[PDB]
Each structure stands twice: as structure tokens, then as C-alpha cells.
Amino acid sequence: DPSTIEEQAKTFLDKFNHEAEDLFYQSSLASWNYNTNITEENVQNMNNAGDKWSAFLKEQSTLAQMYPLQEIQNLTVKLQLQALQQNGSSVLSEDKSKRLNTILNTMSTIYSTGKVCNPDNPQECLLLEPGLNEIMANSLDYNERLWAWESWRSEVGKQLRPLYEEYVVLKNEMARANHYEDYGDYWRGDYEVNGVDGYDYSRGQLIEDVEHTFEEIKPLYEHLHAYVRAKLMNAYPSYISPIGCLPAHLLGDMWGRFWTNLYSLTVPFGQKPNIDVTDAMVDQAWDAQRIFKEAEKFFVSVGLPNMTQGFWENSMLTDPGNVQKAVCHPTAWDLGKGDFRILMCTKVTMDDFLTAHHEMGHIQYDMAYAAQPFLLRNGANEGFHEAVGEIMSLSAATPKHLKSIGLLSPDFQEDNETEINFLLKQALTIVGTLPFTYMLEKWRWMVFKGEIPKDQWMKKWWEMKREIVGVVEPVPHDETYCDPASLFHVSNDYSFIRYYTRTLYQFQFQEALCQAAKHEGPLHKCDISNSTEAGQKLFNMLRLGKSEPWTLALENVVGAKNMNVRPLLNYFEPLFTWLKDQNKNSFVGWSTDWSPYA
Amino acid sequence: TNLCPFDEVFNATRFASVYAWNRKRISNCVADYSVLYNFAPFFTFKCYGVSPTKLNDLCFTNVYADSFVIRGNEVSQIAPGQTGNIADYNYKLPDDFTGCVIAWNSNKLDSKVGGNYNYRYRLFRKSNLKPFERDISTEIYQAGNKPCNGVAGVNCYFPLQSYGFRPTYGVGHQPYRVVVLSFELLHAPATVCG
Numbered sequence A: 001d002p003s004t005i006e007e008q009a010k011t012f013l014d015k016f017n018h019e020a021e022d023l024f025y026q027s028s029l030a031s032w033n034y035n036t037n038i039t040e041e042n043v044q045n046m047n048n049a050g051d052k053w054s055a056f057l058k059e060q061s062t063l064a065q066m067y068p069l070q071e072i073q074n075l076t077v078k079l080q081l082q083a084l085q086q087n088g089s090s091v092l093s094e095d096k097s098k099r100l101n102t103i104l105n106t107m108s109t110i111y112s113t114g115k116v117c118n119p120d121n122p123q124e125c126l127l128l129e130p131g132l133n134e135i136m137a138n139s140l141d142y143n144e145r146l147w148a149w150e151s152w153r154s155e156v157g158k159q160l161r162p163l164y165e166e167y168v169v170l171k172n173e174m175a176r177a178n179h180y181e182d183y184g185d186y187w188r189g190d191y192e193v194n195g196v197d198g199y200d201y202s203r204g205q206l207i208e209d210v211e212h213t214f215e216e217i218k219p220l221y222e223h224l225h226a227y228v229r230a231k232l233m234n235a236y237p238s239y240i241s242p243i244g245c246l247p248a249h250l251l252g253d254m255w256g257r258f259w260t261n262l263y264s265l266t267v268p269f270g271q272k273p274n275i276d277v278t279d280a281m282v283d284q285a286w287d288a289q290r291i292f293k294e295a296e297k298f299f300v301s302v303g304l305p306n307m308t309q310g311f312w313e314n315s316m317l318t319d320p321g322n323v324q325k326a327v328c329h330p331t332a333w334d335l336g337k338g339d340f341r342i343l344m345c346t347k348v349t350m351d352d353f354l355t356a357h358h359e360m361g362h363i364q365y366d367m368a369y370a371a372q373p374f375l376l377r378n379g380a381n382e383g384f385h386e387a388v389g390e391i392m393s394l395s396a397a398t399p400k401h402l403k404s405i406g407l408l409s410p411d412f413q414e415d416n417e418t419e420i421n422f423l424l425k426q427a428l429t430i431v432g433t434l435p436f437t438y439m440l441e442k443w444r445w446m447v448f449k450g451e452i453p454k455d456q457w458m459k460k461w462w463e464m465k466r467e468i469v470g471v472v473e474p475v476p477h478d479e480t481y482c483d484p485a486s487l488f489h490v491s492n493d494y495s496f497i498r499y500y501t502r503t504l505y506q507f508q509f510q511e512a513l514c515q516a517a518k519h520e521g522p523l524h525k526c527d528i529s530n531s532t533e534a535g536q537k538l539f540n541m542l543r544l545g546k547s548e549p550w551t552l553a554l555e556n557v558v559g560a561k562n563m564n565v566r567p568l569l570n571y572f573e574p575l576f577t578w579l580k581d582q583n584k585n586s587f588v589g590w591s592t593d594w595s596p597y598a
Numbered sequence B: 001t002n003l004c005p006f007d008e009v010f011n012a013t014r015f016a017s018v019y020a021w022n023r024k025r026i027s028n029c030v031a032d033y034s035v036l037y038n039f040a041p042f043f044t045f046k047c048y049g050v051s052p053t054k055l056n057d058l059c060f061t062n063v064y065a066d067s068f069v070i071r072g073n074e075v076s077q078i079a080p081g082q083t084g085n086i087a088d089y090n091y092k093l094p095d096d097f098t099g100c101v102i103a104w105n106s107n108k109l110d111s112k113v114g115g116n117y118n119y120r121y122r123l124f125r126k127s128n129l130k131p132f133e134r135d136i137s138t139e140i141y142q143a144g145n146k147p148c149n150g151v152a153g154v155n156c157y158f159p160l161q162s163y164g165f166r167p168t169y170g171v172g173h174q175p176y177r178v179v180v181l182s183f184e185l186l187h188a189p190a191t192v193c194g
């Protein structure tokens, strides 16, 4: 009766789960108290609590690398031990890891504090938020947009370039020392699965599937592109070529990540009354508590539990007056030991109603897998949480739903037109960002692999914008630039592909849930409310945490083990065939070599 | 013909952490479980083995009152047969249980902002607890294959953990005080009536 390596490792993880829930509750209460009541005092407390938790993770990590996964035959255990044994940034030497952090931080403050001052007043400047961003979202003067674009990229980018070079050097050392080939390979690990016969998935299988699904997206995108270039050309006659790429500074935000603001300029049928129940909500005297109550109701409507008493007592659901200050960004906090909170400065609007359904869907996911051991309390892979949150706002924004909750009047006429209006807005948002996202992350994956030398970093970048995205830079940028790094996620070391995969999952789910709901009609009108078979199908994957392979998790909802664009395509197919009609007289696709400056 | 001290147990200033649960011999006295059943603040008031309102009309040879604290999620285990973590390593009921099990929130008095680490459980033990057993040993657990001579180190853990009790915890992770009234009745002189 001696102890097996696995037995020791179970007891190890047992002691670890309780030490951990306590220290993590320390850190997270500290953080909530900083993000709801910013006092240098509470900055100090957040940092001290985060510090102790970091130091405990490092210490248990070093303790757990003494129980070898090779001698462990229990996937739940093996998962926790592998999660616990990543030494990450510590596998570097101390001097180098200190350097890396100084660089990461320098970039992040350079981004948050980057300011550009106009060529006529050197003291009156704008930071990206809220000045430049505001120009790029609203303006219809070409030269103002161009100035925001070039100057943001030349004041801030040209600073980030050397930092980004060294950041790639060090991250690569770290990922190789963590036994990965390059840093991109490390970010791709999130999707890894060994040893689960028939649910396995290797890291390079992610590049294959991303590219394969993008190939079948390309038709829809090319038509959205052809149509949007048509309408922008009608809005900027002497600047856009009817066979060229779209000028990078005319897309609706500082990068062209979302084409959402181009709706005003590309709305199919303007006269049609767009939907916005903001006005109904004031008129029935809806307050935040109402918003979140209707969200609770929606979730309950599908066999899911209502928020904890803790949730209501402790959440921060309204801006807390101008007598104390807080970070106003919806956050769905899972602090542990039963404590679930939401933080949002709610306004009695439509956007905030849809957002509250989203963030409460986060909380729902957090409660479902709470039973799961601590290192498994998380979405199946990096893409799962935000997808779960998105499908709630989908169900919640439909007219069927808005009517049922009395914010819309049964005497509202949906027609082809308003629904094309809706689907086009949806595509300007969802479909637009897709090639953008695949492209940016392909560029980083190559940078890390070493396939794109620094002497061609921007060259290769803008080739890809033209080839993949169908977007062209309005100024030639030498290597003193670093346009990648001018977007938050890039200069703050966040993996980006999670947005591509989230976008494809969310439809894989909705389609599955609406089939569970016995929905008739086009998929974009479907509201899963009042369908316990749907909540149950969903829940059986929610409850999992990341304790099963993300392939099995997915098959629990949608009956298939891998990503698939077909539900995307199907969601948008009305808009597809209307675009295809509208582009008979038009050139579909783009030549890579036109530009506004040659 | 004088009431059985019950406040002395229920409204006692502090409670025992479950691994060292204490036990008062309620005997040679007359019991007020008659009007305490209506105190009406019990998140779990379940007798496993005798009708609840009529325990008055039967005298027992020796009532034993065990009191301790647990988290709500654990209360489910203070039940015959139930084997969670606590009913096999801290306080186990015999499968032929015949007494009562009473439990109420304590978040107000037993919890504190900053963690009340004064109440503890056992999480590691070589073997399951026999019914109604107590273990207050602080001997280091031998999780490994190597000797731990009061070592507290690799594969060797202090067997006692403390509940990090805090008021902002969820209702399942909130402190609950509990009392288990073991009603025994044998040939021994019965002197606990009502």
C-alpha cells in the first residue's frame, strides 16, 4: 500500500484548491474594491492582494512540477497539473524577465497616453480616447479622417516599433523555454487536446481550420465589400476606385476592425424605422434594476437559475453618483465561494439592455461550472465565454422578444426591408471584423515564427491588408512605423484569434439552440426564450468548465466536434442573396495594387 | 422539574469548529424542545428518526447535544449515510440515526470582513470516521511515500484547514451553526422528559 504518483498529486491539488480559493478571493475582492471606488488606498490594496496571489501561484507551480504528468492517468488531474506547471514568464532569467515586463508596461502606457497635437497649436492635443476615436467614428471630411489615422499611427506607432521588436525577441525566448516553437504556437495551445480518442486537437490544426473556414466566408465578405465600396464611392466620389481596396481610414473606426459606423452611409433602406426601444423604456419608467430583472427573467425563462441574493446585494449596476469615481466598463466578476457580481454604469438605453443580457450570460456560465475544481473554472477555450454572451444579446434583440417584453408595439411591421437593414448592420459588425481578425493574427503568427523579417514587417503587413482584407493604406509607411501595435490588443499582448473563433461558435450554438427551440423561419429572428430544452442543451456544456475537451464541449451543444462557418453563412444568407443581386452591376473583389497615393 | 439548559447550547457565545465538535450531556432535567421548535429561524430543522412535535411525550435515557459550525454546502452531510468531506473526516452519523439535526445561518456573528480563520475542518485523514467519533489529532498527514517527522512539507500537510469566513460569501459558503440532538433510550434510567 505505497502511494502512487497520482495519489500524491490528488492530495496536492486538494490542499491547493482551498489555499487557492482563499487567496483568489483576497485578490478579487481587492480588485472589485478598486474598480468600484478608486482610492490610492484601494490601488494599494489591490496591488498587495494581487502580489500575494501571484507569489502563491509561483510557489505552487514550483511545487507541482514534482509530480510528472507522464505518470498520471486521470484527465481531470492531468489537466490541473498541466495548468499548474506552466512556469510561463519564470522560465526566463531574472534580468530578461524584468526587461520583458518593463517593455510590456511601457507599451501599454504609451498606448493609453499617446496624444497627437494639431499642426497649428502645439498645446491643444487629443488622446486616442476620446478624441481621435471620435473623429474616426463620426467625420465625413476625408482630410480630417486621414489626419487622425496617419498621426495616431506616426506619433504612437513610431514609438512602439523598437519596443515591439524586443517584445517579440523576449516572448519568443520564453515560449521556446516553455517548450513551444514560437510565441504564436504558445498562444495557439489554448486549443490543444491530447489523449481523448476522437476529441484530440493539435495546435497547427488551428491554422488549418481558421484558413479553411475563412475560405468559405470569402464569398459573403467579397460581396459585403463590393457593396460597401459602392456606397462609400457614392459618399467620396473622387477618392475611391471601383476596383480598388477600401482606404484604411474610411472604414468607421481607428483601424477598420468594425465597419459598424458605415451603416449611416450604406443603409439599404433609410426611410425604414430602425428599431430602438430606448424610448419605450423611458416611457414605461425602466430603471437599471428593471433591465437586469428582465435579464434574470430571460435566463430563468430557459431553465437557468436566478441571480444569487449575493449578486443583487453586491453588484454595481448604476454609475455610483459623481461623489465617487469608478471604471465604467461592463465586467462579469466571478470572485468565488458563491460570490458573483456584475459591474456596469447602466443607462436606460437599448444598447445597455442588450449588454446586460450579455454580461449576465457570463455570470450564468460562471455559476454553471462553479462546482468544477478551481483550475477548471473557465470557458472550454478562450473563445467560449464571449460567444455565450453574444447569443444572449442575439435572442434579446429580436423583435419577437422585444414585443413579448412590451418594449415593442404588436403594431410594428417587420418586412424584408427592415430585416435587410438589421442583417446589414449585423454584417458590417460581424462579417467585417472577420477578415480583419484572421489577417492581424496571421501577421503576428508569422512575425513570431520568423517568416516575416523586420526589414519587411510593415511591407508584409500592408500586403496582407490589401490581399486578405481588401483594405489599402492611404500613406506609404516605412519601417519606422508599427501600425499593428497601434491597436490596443496588439500593444497589450492579448491573443486576437479568440474573436474569429468566438464569432463562428456563437452561430454554431444559436443554430443548435433554435433547433432545440423548434424555431421556424430565418435563423436571425430566433428568440430562445421560454425553451427549457434549449437552456438544458446549453447548460450541459456550461456546467463543464474547461474539464472536458473543447471539442466535446462543442458537440454537447451542436452535435459536432469542430468549428463550422455554415451557420454563420446561414444566418446571413438573406443578406447574401440581396447583396449578390445588388452587385450585378458592380465589380466584386479587389485589385491589390491601386492606392490613393500612387 | 427545571428546564433543560438549551440556550446554553443554542445561544452560546461561540461554537466549536467541527473537527473538535463538543457535546453536552443533556440529562436529569426536563426539556423545552417544545417551544424552541417554533423559534422559526432554521434553514434546516430535520429530525431523522422521531416525529418533530411529539418528542415531548417520550422520555429518553440520555440526550446528547453536539454543536459545531459548517458551511451550508456541508450541512447536507449532517445526515445518516451521507459521505461528503465532513461526514467521513469530521463528524459522522450512524446509519441507524434516530435524533435531530438543526441548522441556521451565522454569517452575522461567525463571519468577519478579513476572514474568520478560527473555525476549521479536517480535510486529510488515513481513514473514515466511525459514527459519532471525534479526532482532534494535529499529526501531519502522510500523503507521500516518505516519512514526515512533524515535517510540514512535500506530500505532507497539516490536516486542518480553516474556513475563510467572510460576509460577502455566497449562501452555500456562509457559516452555519448546527446542533445534533442524539436521542438515545435504553434500559438506563430515563430522566429527560417534556
Ligand SMILES: *[C@@H]1O[C@H](CO)[C@@H](O[C@@H]2O[C@H](CO)[C@@H](O[C@@H]3O[C@H](CO)[C@@H](O)[C@H](O)[C@@H]3O)[C@H](O)[C@H]2NC(C)=O)[C@H](O)[C@H]1NC(C)=O
Residues within 6 Å of the ligand: A010, A074, A075, A076, A077, B083
Ligand atoms: C480522477 O480522480 C478523481 C478524484 O478521485 C475522480 O473524481 C471522482 O469520480 C468518482 C466517480 O464519478 C466520484 O465517485 C462518487 O462521487 C460523488 C460526488 O457527489 C459521491 O457522492 C459518491 O458516493 C462517490 O464517491 C468521486 O467522488 C470523485 N472524486 C472527487 C474528489 O471528485 C475522477 O473520477 C477520476 N477520473 C477518472 C477518469 O478516473
Ligand SMILES: *[C@@H]1O[C@H](CO)[C@@H](O[C@@H]2O[C@H](CO)[C@@H](O[C@@H]3O[C@H](CO)[C@@H](O)[C@H](O)[C@@H]3O)[C@H](O)[C@H]2NC(C)=O)[C@H](O)[C@H]1NC(C)=O
Residues within 6 Å of the ligand: A062, A065, A066, A085, A087, A090, A091, A092
Ligand atoms: C519549468 O518547468 C519545467 C518542466 O516542468 C521544469 O523542469 C526541470 O527540467 C530540468 C532539466 O531537464 C531538471 O533538472 C535536472 O537536469 C539533469 C541533467 O539534464 C537531469 O538528469 C535531472 O534528473 C533533472 O531533470 C529539473 O529537475 C526540472 N525541474 C522541475 C521542477 O521539473 C523546470 O525546472 C522549470 N523551470 C524553472 C526555471 O523553474
Ligand SMILES: *[C@@H]1O[C@H](CO)[C@@H](O)[C@H](O)[C@H]1NC(C)=O
Residues within 6 Å of the ligand: A033, A037, A039, A041, A042, A323, A324
Ligand atoms: C472607498 O474605499 C475606502 C477603503 O476601502 C473606504 O473606507 C470608503 O468608505 C470607500 N467608499 C468611498 C465612497 O470612497
Ligand SMILES: *[C@@H]1O[C@H](CO)[C@@H](O)[C@H](O)[C@H]1NC(C)=O
Residues within 6 Å of the ligand: A306, A307, A308, A309
Ligand atoms: C428564484 O426562483 C425561485 C422559483 O421557485 C424562487 O422561489 C426564488 O425566490 C427566486 N429568487 C431568488 C433570489 O432565488
Ligand SMILES: *[C@@H]1O[C@H](CO)[C@@H](O)[C@H](O)[C@H]1NC(C)=O
Residues within 6 Å of the ligand: A400, A401, A404, A405, A527, A529, A530
Ligand atoms: C413566455 O411565457 C409567458 C407565459 O405564457 C408569457 O407571458 C411571455 O410573454 C412568454 N415570452 C416569450 C414567448 O418570449
Ligand SMILES: *[C@@H]1O[C@H](CO)[C@@H](O)[C@H](O)[C@H]1NC(C)=O
Residues within 6 Å of the ligand: A416, A417
Ligand atoms: C419583399 O417580399 C416579396 C415576397 O413575394 C417580394 O416579392 C419583394 O420583391 C420583396 N421586396 C424586396 C425589396 O426584396
